Design a protein around this ligand. Structure first.
Ligand code: OWC
Ligand code: OWC
Ligand code: CL
Ligand code: CL
Ligand code: CL
Lengths: 300, 305
């Protein structure tokens, strides 16, 4: 019993964190096999950030301009290339601690663990979700760039995020490990803002099924709803539309608890209307949206 | 910016997790140097748990009755002894991945990271606090026994908790690594319950300082309070007493934000007496008490391990 916001064990990723320095700029890199991946803005000064021409800034760099440190050992850069917004630094040593891994691009609503790092050294691990507005509500200070997001389902680390920037509202933006940003963001100090964020409806429903599995039923009601009526109501509370895909994904949880997906949608509608009236659901006074249907099945 | 419930990186502990099997019971063990530590109830059947005589159950076991698996390698048990509620299995191989470590007993209010394991394999990591009633609000299923709690101070892992049991309210009880239970719990299947819990006041204050550091100031006010008046209000709302030690520990956070500790106490008093009025603090409608002052400083300064 119990339901916690749980991150994947970070050991497999800790053994990949390195420090990357280019001139006065220092950030984190992910060392997998003989390549170190890091945000391309490591080649920029603060002045370069307004309108950087990365191709032009990079052509002026040689391999020895990049200093890569793995623990107390300096790795030798023997090649460099740019792929979208990530810089790939070929090194002369393959990481002996390279786990079984893949690069995966996630969709909004997906969760992942973040291993926050500074100077190539891991500081902490926490659980995140890719928000519908493509930002993540992280905990990142200056120097955290290059920290990564991942999932570890069955011994294989799936890297899904690399941290690049903090937006004005204190939320965070980054790329997949191929260097493509999540969201309409760019690695430029231009006016950028997070779009209006919404609640990940399918995740709130998953969490309500987690609460039922753990013995709580106070929020259930005798009502059901159509999918369209639910969406009309939910959008008024800034909730993401629930699609037929989401209803299908919640099938296993619906079968386990005996509560049909549209019956749980009716409880959610009522919770949005009434609030909790001094009660809690899994130790929370707010509806939690950073647990996916998959995370619920994994934990419960 | 941002403030998350953050655990310590678990890699140093993952390299110590092993599976321990005694008869039909399988649980987790912590392999440090040539010893595997695990709950002593691994030698019990469900019937034994009703009224176990651990010394008597253990004397009937030989080394080969304990099967210890580290990954896909079977370790050979060459000795066994009991220390309080922890079984120590001497093995013929020292763990090459043994980090610099210590065994520490924590106080209620102190937080730690739990690496939840099943069959000697780490499944997840989360942060939690030792409640004032000595339970932890963990997330553990059958098979999680032997999972450990820890903190990291520089490059040293301080093991502070080993999982043993779940109480009827779904909360958890365990021991330090010397096998001493936190709380008035016993490793026996008998009527046991968590006592009435209280809120960790110093931790709520630390979290309120974290909210101020992150730009959330709506709860600040012009008022201050005495420590004694604050403690009368704390007692009324099932909050732990705030001591002068707690006030001292919050000094650095008070200096950084410019809000005196007793000035933050007046915010907390107002929050307890009036609620949040539809507002949230760091994305929470409840006052969070599972971040110590040290946790707040560490996360807001970027301390690494
Ligand atoms: O956002 C940025 C800067 C930036 C500016 C524009 C585009 C890009 Cl891709 C990056 C570069 C320096 C690091 N940085 C930060 C990244 N994460 C957390 C931060 C917390 C506080 C202060 C800066 C933070
Ligand atoms: O509490 C116990 C049992 C127990 C009974 C009496 C004393 C002692 Cl020390 C242990 C033994 C089996 C494992 N166990 C559990 C431990 N954690 C989470 C559990 C979730 C569901 C079911 C059992 C759980
Ligand atoms: Cl996805
Ligand atoms: Cl006994
Ligand atoms: Cl409150």
């Amino acid at each position: 019993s119990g339901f916690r916001k749980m991150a994947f064990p970070s050991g497999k990723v800790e053994g990949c964190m390195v420090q990357v320095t280019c001139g006065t700029t220092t950030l984190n890199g992910l060392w997998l096999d003989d390549v170190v991946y890091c945000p391309r803005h490591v080649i920029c000064t603060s002045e370069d950030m307004l309108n950087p021409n990365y191709e032009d800034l990079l052509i002026r760099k040689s391999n020895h301009n990049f200093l890569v440190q793995a623990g107390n050992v300096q790795l030798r850069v023997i090649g460099h290339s740019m792929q979208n917004c990530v810089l790939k630094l070929k090194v002369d040593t393959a990481n002996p601690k390279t786990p079984k891994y893949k690069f995966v691009r996630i969709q909004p609503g997906q969760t992942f663990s973040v291993l926050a790092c500074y100077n190539g050294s891991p500081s902490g691990v926490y659980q995140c979700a890719m928000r519908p507005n493509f930002t993540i509500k992280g905990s990142f200070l200056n120097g955290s760039c290059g920290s990564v997001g991942f999932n570890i389902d069955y011994d294989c680390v799936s890297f899904c995020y690399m941290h690049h920037m903090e937006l004005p509202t204190g939320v965070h933006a980054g790329t997949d490990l191929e260097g493509n940003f999540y969201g309409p963001f760019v690695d430029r100090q231009t006016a950028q803002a997070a779009g209006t964020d919404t609640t990940i409806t399918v995740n709130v429903l998953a969490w309500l099924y987690a609460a039922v599995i753990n013995g709580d039923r106070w929020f259930l009601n005798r009502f059901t709803t159509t999918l369209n009526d639910f969406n009309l109501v939910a959008m008024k509370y800034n909730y993401e539309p629930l699609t037929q895909d989401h209803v299908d994904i919640l099938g296993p949880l619906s079968a386990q608890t005996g509560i049909a997906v549209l019956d749980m949608c009716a409880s959610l509608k009522e919770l949005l209307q009434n609030g909790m009236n001094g009660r809690t659901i899994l130790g929370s006074a707010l509806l939690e949206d950073e647990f996916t249907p998959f995370d619920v099945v994994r934990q419960c």
